[PDB]
Design a protein around this nucleic acid. Structure first.
Ligand SMILES: [Mg+2]
Lengths: 98, 44, 1324, 493
RNA sequence: GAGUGGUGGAGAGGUA
DNA sequence: TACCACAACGAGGTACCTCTCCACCAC
DNA sequence: GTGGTGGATACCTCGTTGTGGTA
């Protein structure tokens, strides 16, 4: 739900227009433009920036009970960052074995 | 050990052994030379 | 504040009031080595412990023994700078007093035979510097702490080994600290085994069979006892109610008049309630229940005298008939279950082919030393030596702790070896694990891995060397002469010194120090490596050891590991993380007291943390009241959850304590992804120090901690006023309050000007205080290599715009303005050492001289008459620095010219030439000039020392003169230097004057004799290498400006490579007129997710807006009151900021000096995880009269017109890393060649070529460029005739190729033919 | 290229034919490897032949059973111990007779495992009688010596001599062979001479493969010694270290950077690397232009770096490609050949289109420059490995020169449209007037206008008709259509 | 008949 | 005699850069 | 200097391939 509201509230925002009416169109927002043209990053990375970071995983294949309800604009607290380091180190040992 | 026991010989027809030995590979450009050399060797 | 702290007040933004200071960051190295080297007679740590654990030692008979008396460490005859220059270990002599007491064999204990005691010199142990670095062979090395698995027992289980079954197999293991392992494990058949040190399996009962135990003790020890009783051909069963749990009724278990269970019915808990509420014991049991049970004890028939049945036999009808006819009325029987007491030990006793201690010992010797002819005494001696020898098995005082606290015991002491009941209890806990009661261990939970530091490793190497020399001296003393032998003739000092020098020089862990910048030194000292001896490798340790275990919280950083093949094996120690008594890691925690967090600081180890529940630092506190929310957040029992505000037990001590030093130095850490913050916290460790060190505007408040505690600045010892500051040295006059009267009252701070680092960068010390400027204790005086005013200052902060610019910042690339080069903001200094040795052939020693043949004035014109370059001549690559020549014939006849040359690509000045010699060659004019300058500067500096020393001692004698009597007018009416001749009547002050004059003459004596010591050490030869004569060392110092290819990076993992140095007109500007300096790439942000650079860019622009307003006010010179008002308003800004600074306590000149220090910006402290929120940054920007979003409207300097959309502009702190394009670029046309394979060399030093590897051979193959592949494997490489024809043909202009068989293929032919397999080239 | 031989006193066993599973002796003599190992460990005897019925042929005996056979018969049999015993057994074994015995004994019953072992032995015997090798030849009597310049001896800088491992291994086997020679002509006791034969056997098995038979004999520096098998096989053996992939001459290396001003076939080579790489070409052009007469004058004229040398380099470089390899060269397009242009500086410039093929990021990635020399190699690097020939990857027919992230942001910002930005609803003659409008600033890039576009439909054959109408597009799309060539429709843009 | 030594090998750290 | 645990060998990414360290014995 | 030379650590993870054991 938070990702859907985020992508709507990022996609259709340049509404202040005239000469036909107050028209709603696709937005000239920079983050959305660099993610929408196919340039760099996708909707998952945009969701991790703006919306909800989500349910990170413990290394044992489990899912942690409490999700990271913050993102990389409000900034995480200690516990969410310590949770995020699980996936970070699992990815960077996965690259070695891969 | 097994090749020494069986007394094998290698016909030198693969790219890896022609890269080890140091001729043109039997592909790409060198394939014309290799079919020319093998028809010359079969022709005498 | 302090007097240095009023010079620049870094503005804070944190909101939590911090409650603990940052601990001394080098405490681990210094405390471990101080515990190793310090003389502890009571709390035995280090040298006294090892000596008392080996002394005394007797002979084979016991007629003589060596007693240890004491030990003392003398002065190192060289100090640390002299050792660094000369290239030798900085060490102290180990002088040990030792007593020889001889015994008589005529008397039974004839102790009084001959007393002998003396000091014997043995070993040269290397010492530590003030800041934790060892100095070996001149270089500065650092011993990294190690994290091995602690001694004790670890119950483990591999899941999914037998893939056909998939059953779990719990395997125990006893790791000791010294000795051999002991491994118990089951099979899929559930039989215990023993694998001593990865040999074959043995039946596990054979160890206790060797431990003088019989089968009766086995069954009564492991299996609980049930009793059958035969009476009038029926069986009476004594039944306790804790036996019928979860099974099916074989018969009708009844009572005398009560019915409980039916035939083929599961025994229920309600039926168990019925049995425990009737409380019956004896029940009759029919015959079919016995068939399946196993007999406990043996039953010998009383009449015939033979054994009817032994122990552990399966009962049958004829067996019970034989027992009833023999008449054994009482029957002892084991308890067999499938739930709590499984048939495991009985099955191993059945499958065990051994019977007694003799067969057990010969079997275990046949396993341990196989093939040897076995015997009883050898087997029992190896068995006692394998586990129960004190000199062959040690695990004490930490493994004894873990063994008892893993065996559910209470006390933390015991013996240093294993024992019978100990192995019995380990096996018992293993069976409890196998049936279900108990819990297995994980292997990376930090109550199992232990920090083993430099003191423990040095003591272990000392102990092994001492054991070897003890065995040698016992083999000497057991037969040698007794009466006329001093111990210094029998103690060979070789193996101790060889062992300790070997550990400090070539171990797995004593590694070379990276000192690019003070952060690199400090996070190379606080490093936790898991490799080395006794630990794992970088191949055989998969995902388990590398992953972030949840008990790393606070002890070990999760975002500082190398990214290579050591992705988790090199931990870095967190900020507040101390060490236990035994060696485990521990953190500070604040105790709660009825919902109030009282500031008494309890330390919690890794294991004691788990039982409490611990609140988090982000939990709000109401002015030392309580929490706000009833449902606070906590972490508990190995995870994280919610709790109440009264149910908690502890709170975090700060918010820095999750991350290490390096990752704490990153601002806006809470907004970066963990990958990119790890990249940044590793790329801050590689920042070359630039020319003028420049502070960060956006910091973390750990910069002063790093630059002070990294030990590279000149921090004061006692506060006072400066007496004379120079560019070379700072001297200080101490406060009379903070002076002890026995001293003279003047400290001297010599500075190390422009000395080479370990990575060839520059290190110098500019003073930061001026004359007439009071300092306090703990203040900074002289800045290090990359320090500005005692803050860490690694790179320079520069204007940054975030937009694409004509492609020139494409895929992580950086476009840098001209004014960054014109201001010389990034020109580092690289000081490079080139060496020249005069070796000795057997045709005469080599000559360092300027009458070299075959040369003219195009090379020799820079050198003097002596054949050595001047101090200060700018050389270029390939020119002669030291003209060395060698006698070619016998003793022209010196024809071979072996002078130095600058390597192609090195330039610059010659800042120093240092010449060493051996005694045996006479010096020249150049060596005499260097030693004369050294003599004159030594006399000059130590005479300035004497002069300030006589100033201090004349103050001292005027103090004792006015203390004894009143003598002032003749004291100041007479010159101060003739204060030794003044006197009065003979009393205690007169005698003090005579002895202090004698002390002054003795100061002159040690003065002149240490001048003569340095004089004879520089005129006489140092102990050089075998077969050299004199060694000349030069030092070249280039100045490396930036250019396209020099790597650059901010703090957040945004690395780049400079792509164009655009002119100032082509750089984009803004409407005020200021051109931007770096046009970064905006697409690096949104996918890599480092938003810390965006928030730091905005906060940097706010900081420079405030600094620009202060610079405007000063350049218009408005008012000191307007300055005071604006700066006070700038500081009292945030919502609930921690700091508070009022300027009414500041003077006029104080606020003027503060505004002068802030005219280049207002530095800001953003703590990691207590950061400045964007509303606070927008408040700061509104103070600065800037656009609040940070985005301004840049123009285009190229075509004049406007960029369509607003561009983000601020001040990001760019480093410059140690990957310089001058060191990276290398090319080769035709050069050297190897000896075995005749293919060209490899490496920029040997001028070798790039390896055109196997993957590139497949690339050419799948293209089809057969001629390119053939010419790249024959004539551009190992084929000598073809390459000579190729070179000659290319010079003649025709590019043609004559191939041939490669020399490596001919090497392969010779190697197989020498291996003994006939391989040849059959024609056609 | 010369070889030496060692006269071994006792015969010995080649460890490859004892421990390369299956050993070929354990399958040749149909005896278990444990028994052959206990023979060559000098712990047990085997009778070769016996006229009595007590001792059957190839019956392994312990030492107590051996001396029991000596006190029983002592004269009729012969039980030996060591490699000479198995050498005599290999001499006495008749290849054609035992393979005929195998061929008559196979067909009676067909059990699976024994039939497998039997057909393995028949393949071994048939391979031997085909190849003409001798089964006696598995036992070494004359051990060869490698040429001395392939186990070389260069000292260290301080006169101390650091050898290879093979000189140490050969020293050990030669010294123990001399001691066995002294004990044989001394006629030592049999226990002593069999102990020295054991030690010689262990030394030569160490020489043939150190870490194979038992405890690998370690070197003087606490490391295991390198044998001949460890010098042939490996990730750093001779094959995969110096035969398949060789270090090569004519090769540079530098930090890469971005050149947007290039074309598709160009890279910016630095002056210094190019002057080094093309050094004999510069010598040849200098001698051809009459300025250089000798090699020393050419060498010093290059190392003085004159303006005539810079002009000669600028003439040599002209349309002579270089191969910009990047490692790890995973797929086929990791080597591409570009015609270099000269730059100052110290960093190789790439096109931005080829750094998707390379998987290059310009954050410090280094790349190599290999030169082709011959005319065949220059023509192969122009006609096969040029950057303008590997447009489409061989994994899928979809092109690999795709714009990537910055060109993509620019083309997206060109061809997108707002609603009523600036000068919308105008009518334009075409792309020339539209780009004149945009550069003058009277209409923004996002005004929806009408333009007259003369697009070109290509017909079924290669003819080009020209159609023309009015399209309701953006100014940015009208500007991009000026770039788009003749042959494409408009709905592309 | 006209100058000259690391590759060899180990260990540690780093880059892509 | 056909399944079978058990033991033994044989793999484990390319390219590059920096530094230090190198057998004991012995009349 | 110039021939001589033998002993007190364990801590990968599959994955084929060959081997003695037993229903
Ligand atoms: Mg990269």
């Amino acid at each position: 739900r938070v990702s859907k509201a985020m992508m709507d509230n990022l996609q259709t925002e340049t509404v202040i227009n005239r000469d036909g009416q107050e028209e709603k169109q696709v937005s000239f927002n920079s983050i959305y433009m660099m993610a929408d043209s196919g340039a760099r990053g996708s909707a998952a990375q945009i969701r991790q920036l703006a919306g909800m970071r989500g349910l990170m995983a413990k290394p044992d294949g489990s899912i942690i009970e409490t999700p990271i309800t913050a993102n990389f604009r409000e900034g995480l607290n200690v516990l969410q960052y310590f949770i995020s380091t699980h996936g970070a180190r699992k990815g960077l040992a996965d690259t070695a074995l891969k | 050990t097994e090749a020494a026991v069986a007394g094998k010989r290698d016909e030198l027809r693969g790219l890896k052994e022609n890269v080890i030995v140091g001729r043109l590979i039997p592909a790409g450009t060198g394939y014309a030379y290799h079919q020319d050399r093998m028809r010359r060797r079969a022709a005498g | 504040y302090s007097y240095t702290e009023k010079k620049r007040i870094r503005k804070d933004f944190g909101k939590r009031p911090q409650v603990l200071d940052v601990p001394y960051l080098l405490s681990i190295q210094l405390d471990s080595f101080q515990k190793f080297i310090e003389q502890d007679p009571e709390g035995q740590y280090g040298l006294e412990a090892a000596f008392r654990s080996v002394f005394p030692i007797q002979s084979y008979s016991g007629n003589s023994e060596l007693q240890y008396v004491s030990y003392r460490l003398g002065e190192p005859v060289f100090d640390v700078q002299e050792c660094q220059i000369r290239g030798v270990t900085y060490s102290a002599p180990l002088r040990v007093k030792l007593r020889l007491v001889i015994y008589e064999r005529e008397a039974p204990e004839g102790t009084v035979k001959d007393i002998k005691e003396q000091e014997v010199y043995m070993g040269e142990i290397p010492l530590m510097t003030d800041n934790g670095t060892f100095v070996i062979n001149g270089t500065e090395r650092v011993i990294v702490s190690q994290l091995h698995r602690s001694p004790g027992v670890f119950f483990d289980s591999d899941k999914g080994k037998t893939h056909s079954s998939g059953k779990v197999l719990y395997n125990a293991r006893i790791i000791p600290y010294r000795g051999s392992w002991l491994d118990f494990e089951f099979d899929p058949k559930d039989n215990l085994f023993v694998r001593i040190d990865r040999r074959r399996k043995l039946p596990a009962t054979i160890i206790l069979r060797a431990l003088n135990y019989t089968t009766e003790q086995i069954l009564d020890l492991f299996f609980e006892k049930v009793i059958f009783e035969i009476r009038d051909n029926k069986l009476q069963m004594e039944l306790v109610p804790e036996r019928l749990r979860g099974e099916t009724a074989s018969f009708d278990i009844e009572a005398n008049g009560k019915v409980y269970v039916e035939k083929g019915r599961r025994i229920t808990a309600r039926h168990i309630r019925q049995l425990e509420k009737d409380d019956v014991k004896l029940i009759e049991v029919p015959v079919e229940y016995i068939a399946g049970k196993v007999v406990a004890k043996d039953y010998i028939d009383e009449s015939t005298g033979e054994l009817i049945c032994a122990a552990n036999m399966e009962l049958s009808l004829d067996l019970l008939a034989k027992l009833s006819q023999s008449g054994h009325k009482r029957i002892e029987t084991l308890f067999t279950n499938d739930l709590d007491h499984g048939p495991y030990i009985s099955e191993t006793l059945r499958v065990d082919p051994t019977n007694d201690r003799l067969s057990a010992l010969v079997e275990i010797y046949r396993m341990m030393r196989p093939g040897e002819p076995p015997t009883r005494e050898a087997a029992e001696s190896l068995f006692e030596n394998l586990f129960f020898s004190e000199d062959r098995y040690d695990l004490s005082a930490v493994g004894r702790m873990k063994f008892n606290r893993s065996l559910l015991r209470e006390e933390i002491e015991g013996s240093g070896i294993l024992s019978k009941d100990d192995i019995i209890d380990v096996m018992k806990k293993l069976i409890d694990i196998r049936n279900g009661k108990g819990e297995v261990d994980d292997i990376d939970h930090l109550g199992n891995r232990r920090i083993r530091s430099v003191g423990e490793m040095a003591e272990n190497q000392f102990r092994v060397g001492l054991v070897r020399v003890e065995r040698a001296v016992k083999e000497r003393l057991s037969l040698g002469d007794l009466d006329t032998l001093m111990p210094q003739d029998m103690i060979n000092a070789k193996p101790i010194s060889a062992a300790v020098k070997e550990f400090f020089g070539s171990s797995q862990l004593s590694q070379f120090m990276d000192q690019n910048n003070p952060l690199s030194e400090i996070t190379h000292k606080r490093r936790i490596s898991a490799l080395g001896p006794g630990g794992l490798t970088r191949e055989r340790a998969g995902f388990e050891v590398r992953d972030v275990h949840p008990t790393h919280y606070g002890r070990v950083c999760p975002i500082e590991t190398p990214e290579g093949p050591n992705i988790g094996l090199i931990n870095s120690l967190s900020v507040y993380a101390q060490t236990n008594e035994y060696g485990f890691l521990e953190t500070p925690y604040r105790k709660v007291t009825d919902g109030v967090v009282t500031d008494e600081i309890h330390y919690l180890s890794a294991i004691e943390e788990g039982n409490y529940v611990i609140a988090q630092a982000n939990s709000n506190l109401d002015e030392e009241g309580h929490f706000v929310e009833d449902l606070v957040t906590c972490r508990s029992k190995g995870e994280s959850s919610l709790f109440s505000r009264d149910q908690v037990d502890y709170m975090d001590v700060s918010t820095q304590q999750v991350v290490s030093v390096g990752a704490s130095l990153i601002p806006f850490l809470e907004h970066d992804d963990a990958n990119r913050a790890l990249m940044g916290a590793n790329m801050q460790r590689q920042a070359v120090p630039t020319l003028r060190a420049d502070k960060p505007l956006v910091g973390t408040g750990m910069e002063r901690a790093v630059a002070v505690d990294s030990g590279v600045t000149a921090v004061a010892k006692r506060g006072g006023v400066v007496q004379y500051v120079d560019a070379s040295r700072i001297v200080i006059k101490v406060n009379e309050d903070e002076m002890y009267p026995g001293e003279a009252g003047i400290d001297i701070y010599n500075l190390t000007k422009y000395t080479r680092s370990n990575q060839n960068t520059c290190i110098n010390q500019m003073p930061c205080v001026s004359l007439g400027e009071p300092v306090e204790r703990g203040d900074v005086l002289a800045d290090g290599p990359s320090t500005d005013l005692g803050e860490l200052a690694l790179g320079q902060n520069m204007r940054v715009a975030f937009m694409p610019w004509n492609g020139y910042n494409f895929e992580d690339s950086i476009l840098v303005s001209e004014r960054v080069v014109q201001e010389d903001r990034f020109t580092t200094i690289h000081i490079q050492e080139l060496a020249c040795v005069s070796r000795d052939t057997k045709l005469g020693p080599e000559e360092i001289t300027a009458d070299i043949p075959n040369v003219g004035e195009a090379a020799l014109s820079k050198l003097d008459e002596s054949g050595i370059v001047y101090i200060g001549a700018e050389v270029t690559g390939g020119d002669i620095l030291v003209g060395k020549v060698t006698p070619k014939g016998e003793t022209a006849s010196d024809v071979k010219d072996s002078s130095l040359r600058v390597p192609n690509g090195v330039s610059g000045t010659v800042i120093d030439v240092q010449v060493f010699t051996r005694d045996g060659v006479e010096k020249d004019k150049r060596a005499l000039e260097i030693e004369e300058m050294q003599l004159k500067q030594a006399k000059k500096d130590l005479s300035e020392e004497l002069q300030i020393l006589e100033a201090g001692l004349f103050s001292r004698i005027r103090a004792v003169l006015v203390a004894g009597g009143v003598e002032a007018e003749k004291l100041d009416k007479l010159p101060r230097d003739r204060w030794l001749e003044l006197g009065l009547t003979d009393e205690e002050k007169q005698n003090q004057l005579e002895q202090l004059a004698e002390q002054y003459d003795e100061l002159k004596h040690e003065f002149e004799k240490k001048l003569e010591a340095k004089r004879r050490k520089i005129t006489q030869g140092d102990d050089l290498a075998p077969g050299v004569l004199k060694i000349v060392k030069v030092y070249l110092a280039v100045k490396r400006r930036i250019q396209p290819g020099d790597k650059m990076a901010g703090r957040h993992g945004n690395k780049g490579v400079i792509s164009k140095i655009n002119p100032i007109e082509d750089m984009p500007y803004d409407e005020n007129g200021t051109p931007v300096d770096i046009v970064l790439n905006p697409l690096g942000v949104p996918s890599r997710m480092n938003i810390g650079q965006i928030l730091e860019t905005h906060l940097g622009m706010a900081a420079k807006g405030i600094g620009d307003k202060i610079n405007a006010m000063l350049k218009q010179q408005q008012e000191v009151a307007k300055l005071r008002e604006f700066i006070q308003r700038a500081y009292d800004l945030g919502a609930d900021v921690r700091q508070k600074v009022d300027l009414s306590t500041f003077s006029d000149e104080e606020v003027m000096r503060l505004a002068e220090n802030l005219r280049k910006g207002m530095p800001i402290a953003t703590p990691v995880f207590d950061g400045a929120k964007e509303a606070e940054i927008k408040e700061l920007l509104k103070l600065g009269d800037l656009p609040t979003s940070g985005q301004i409207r840049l123009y285009d300097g190229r075509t004049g017109e406007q960029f369509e959309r607003p561009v983000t502009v601020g001040y990001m702190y760019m480093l410059k890393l140690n990957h310089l394009v001058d060191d990276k670029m290398h090319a080769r046309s035709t050069g050297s060649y190897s000896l075995v394979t005749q293919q060209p060399l490899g490496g920029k030093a040997q001028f070798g070529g790039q390896r055109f590897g196997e993957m590139e051979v497949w690339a050419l193959e799948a293209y089809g460029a057969a001629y390119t592949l053939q010419e790249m494997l024959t004539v551009k490489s190992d084929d000598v005739n073809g390459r000579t024809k190729m070179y000659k043909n290319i010079v003649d202009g025709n590019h043609q190729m004559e191939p041939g068989m490669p020399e490596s293929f001919n090497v392969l032919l010779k190697e197989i033919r020498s291996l003994g397999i006939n391989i040849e080239l059959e024609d056609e | 290229e010369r070889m030496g031989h060692i006269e071994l006193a006792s015969p010995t066993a080649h460890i490859w034919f004892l421990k390369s599973l299956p050993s070929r002796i354990g399958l040749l003599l149909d005896m278990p490897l444990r028994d052959i190992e206990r023979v060559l460990y000098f712990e047990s005897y085997v009778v070769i032949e016996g006229g009595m019925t007590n001792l059957e042929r190839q019956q392994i005996l312990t030492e107590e059973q051996y001396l029991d056979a000596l006190e029983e018969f002592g004269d009729e049999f012969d039980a030996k111990m060591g490699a000479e015993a198995i050498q005599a057994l290999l001499k006495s074994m008749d290849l054609e007779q035992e393979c005929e015995q195998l061929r008559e004994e196979l067909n009676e019953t067909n059990s699976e495992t024994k039939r497998k072992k039997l057909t393995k032995r028949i393949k071994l015997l048939e391979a031997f009688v085909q190849s003409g090798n001798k089964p006696e030849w598995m036992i070494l009597t004359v051990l060869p010596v490698l040429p001395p310049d392939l186990r070389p001896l260069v000292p260290l800088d301080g006169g101390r001599f650091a050898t290879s491992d093979l000189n140490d291994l050969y020293r050990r086997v030669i010294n123990r062979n001399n001691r066995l020679k002294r004990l044989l002509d001394l006629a030592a006791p049999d226990i002593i001479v069999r102990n020295e034969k054991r030690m010689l056997q262990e030394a030569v098995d160490a020489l043939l493969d150190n870490g194979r038979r038992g405890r690998a004999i370690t070197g003087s520096n606490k490391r295991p010694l390198k044998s001949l098998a460890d010098m042939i096989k490996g990730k750093q053996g001779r094959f995969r270290q110096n035969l398949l992939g060789k270090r090569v001459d004519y090769s540079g290396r530098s930090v890469i950077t971005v050149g947007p001003y290039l074309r598709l076939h160009q890279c910016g080579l630095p002056k210094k690397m190019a002057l080094e790489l093309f050094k004999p070409f510069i010598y040849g052009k200098l001698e051809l232009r009459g300025l250089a007469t000798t090699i020393k004058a050419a060498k010093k004229m290059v190392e003085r770096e004159e303006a005539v040398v810079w002009d000669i380099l600028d003439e040599v470089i002209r349309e002579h490609p270089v191969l910009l390899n990047r490692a790890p060269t995973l797929h086929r397009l990791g080597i591409q050949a570009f015609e270099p242009v000269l730059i100052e500086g110290k960093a190789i410039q790439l096109h931005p289109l080829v750094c998707a093929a390379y998987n290059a990021d310009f954050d410090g990635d280094q790349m190599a420059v290999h030169v082709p020399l011959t005319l065949e190699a220059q023509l192969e690097a122009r006609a096969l490995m040029m950057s303008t020939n590997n447009i489409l990857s061989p994994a899928n027919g979809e092109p690999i020169i795709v714009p990537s992230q910055d060109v993509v942001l620019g083309l997206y910002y060109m061809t997108r449209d707002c609603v009523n930005a600036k000068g919308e609803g105008m009518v334009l003659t075409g792309p020339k007037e539209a780009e004149r409008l945009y550069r003058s600033g009277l209409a923004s890039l996002h005004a929806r206008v009408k333009v007259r576009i003369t697009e070109y439909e290509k017909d079924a054959n290669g003819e080009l008709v020209a159609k023309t109408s009015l399209k309701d597009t953006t100014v940015g799309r009208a500007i991009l259509w000026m770039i788009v060539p003749k042959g494409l429709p408009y709905s592309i843009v």
